[PDB]
Amino acid sequence: GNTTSSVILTNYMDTQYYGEIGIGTPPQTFKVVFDTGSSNVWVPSSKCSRLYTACVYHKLFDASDSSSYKHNGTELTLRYSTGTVSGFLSQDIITVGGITVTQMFGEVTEMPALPFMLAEFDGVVGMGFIEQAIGRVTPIFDNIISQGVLKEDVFSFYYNRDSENSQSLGGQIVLGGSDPQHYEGNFHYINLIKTGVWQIQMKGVSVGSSTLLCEDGCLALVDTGASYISGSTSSIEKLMEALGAKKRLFDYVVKCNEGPTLPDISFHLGGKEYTLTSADYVFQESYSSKKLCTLAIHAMDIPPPTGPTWALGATFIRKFYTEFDRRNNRIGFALAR
Numbered sequence: 001g002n003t004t005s006s007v008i009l010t011n012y013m014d015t016q017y018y019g020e021i022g023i024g025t026p027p028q029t030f031k032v033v034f035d036t037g038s039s040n041v042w043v044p045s046s047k048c049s050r051l052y053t054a055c056v057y058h059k060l061f062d063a064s065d066s067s068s069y070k071h072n073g074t075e076l077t078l079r080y081s082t083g084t085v086s087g088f089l090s091q092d093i094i095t096v097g098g099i100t101v102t103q104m105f106g107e108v109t110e111m112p113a114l115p116f117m118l119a120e121f122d123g124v125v126g127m128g129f130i131e132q133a134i135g136r137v138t139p140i141f142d143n144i145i146s147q148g149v150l151k152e153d154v155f156s157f158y159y160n161r162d163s164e165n166s167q168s169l170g171g172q173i174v175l176g177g178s179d180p181q182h183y184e185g186n187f188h189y190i191n192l193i194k195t196g197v198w199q200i201q202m203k204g205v206s207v208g209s210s211t212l213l214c215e216d217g218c219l220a221l222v223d224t225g226a227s228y229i230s231g232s233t234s235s236i237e238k239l240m241e242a243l244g245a246k247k248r249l250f251d252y253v254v255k256c257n258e259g260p261t262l263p264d265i266s267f268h269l270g271g272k273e274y275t276l277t278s279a280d281y282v283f284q285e286s287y288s289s290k291k292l293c294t295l296a297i298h299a300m301d302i303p304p305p306t307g308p309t310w311a312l313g314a315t316f317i318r319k320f321y322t323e324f325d326r327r328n329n330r331i332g333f334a335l336a337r
């Protein structure tokens with residue numbers, strides 16, 4: 001192939017990065033997260049009961065308004081770390097950054113308020129492998145590859161640190177390459193443990209100068225759909241005791257004045273150390289001892305076969321521009337700019 005294609009992303013509060021796709025003829029536009037942690041495409045359906053408040057608030061796909069729609073109707077349930085969606089399969093034309101593909105996707109009829117009422121996006125575009133696709137449906141990137149239009153069998157993620165001011169650009173996905181404008185230095189590559197999952201070996205997790213965690217190795221899922229860096233409950237409990245952080249319901253907190261005093265956290269991947277300073281992992285919203293500041297690291301127990309794993313989400317990608325290489329089954333990291 002010859003072409004490169006980009007998807008402009010919106011950065012919502014440093015936690016949600018989403019772009020727009022079109023589905024059907026004429027195109028019905030949806031805000032979607034592009035998720036390397038999963039392999040299914042889904043959007044909410046017009047068939048979703050309005051008793052699900054998430055379906056009242058999000059954009060719904062109406063098959064009755066699309067002349068290119070092809071019925072399927074196979075029921076499917078997608079169980080994610082933060083919640084579950086259920087619905088049925090359909091086929092239609094999807095437009096992603098100027099690229100048009102015929103795609104099988106889920107029409108979601110059951111969409112829980114938690115977490116979906118907290119989502120700025122409507123659906124998900126899974127960027128993982130067919131091996132992880134529920135119902136063994138061909139993932140969108142595999143269908144785009146089949147077209148033979150892309151210069152390379154790769155895709156790259158840039159997630160901006162700036163979520164506020166306009167004219168910044170929230171983030172960017174490049175289909176078929178990388179954007180040198182958003183990284184510096186050279187890519188350092190890490191081969192996948194196996195095909196089918198964007199997961200790599202991690203050799204250790206350091207808090208300051210000492211390797212408190214993951215000595216003897218562990219797994220690291222490079223997950224564009226996750227807002228934070230996550231580890232298993234036991235790993236995070238140990239990590240947080242070392243930081244002096246206090247557990248709450250859905251996160252860990254530190255007194256805001258303590259934020260800048262927190263140690264660096266280093267991830268040992270492919271012989272290189274990937275270091276995040278406290279500015280990279282603390283939501284430093286004030287400097288008061290009277291206020292609590294949340295950390296962009298949390299516990300998430302991912303079940304087998306994928307888990308138990310650490311997940312390197314938006315917290316990590318903000319610092320490290322990421323290239324997902326399908327041709328060589330590897331992931332490249334470079335310093336984002």
Ligand SMILES: O=C(c1c(Oc2ccccc2)n(-c2ccccc2)c2ccccc12)N1CCNCC1
Pocket residue numbers: 015016033035037038080081082083115116118119120124223224225226227228
């Ligand atoms: O469930 C999540 C996650 C998720 O939802 C998604 C649901 C489906 C697809 C993508 C995101 N969100 C999320 C973020 C903001 C609002 C609602 C949900 C997470 C926030 C932190 C950590 C994980 C997830 N996963 C599991 C699937 N892969 C990415 C992380």
Ligand SMILES: *[C@@H]1O[C@H](CO)[C@@H](O)[C@H](O)[C@H]1NC(C)=O
Pocket residue numbers: 071072073074089104
């Ligand atoms: C749904 O799609 C798959 C092809 O991807 C097909 O094999 C299956 O039989 C379809 N079912 C119907 C009822 O159209």
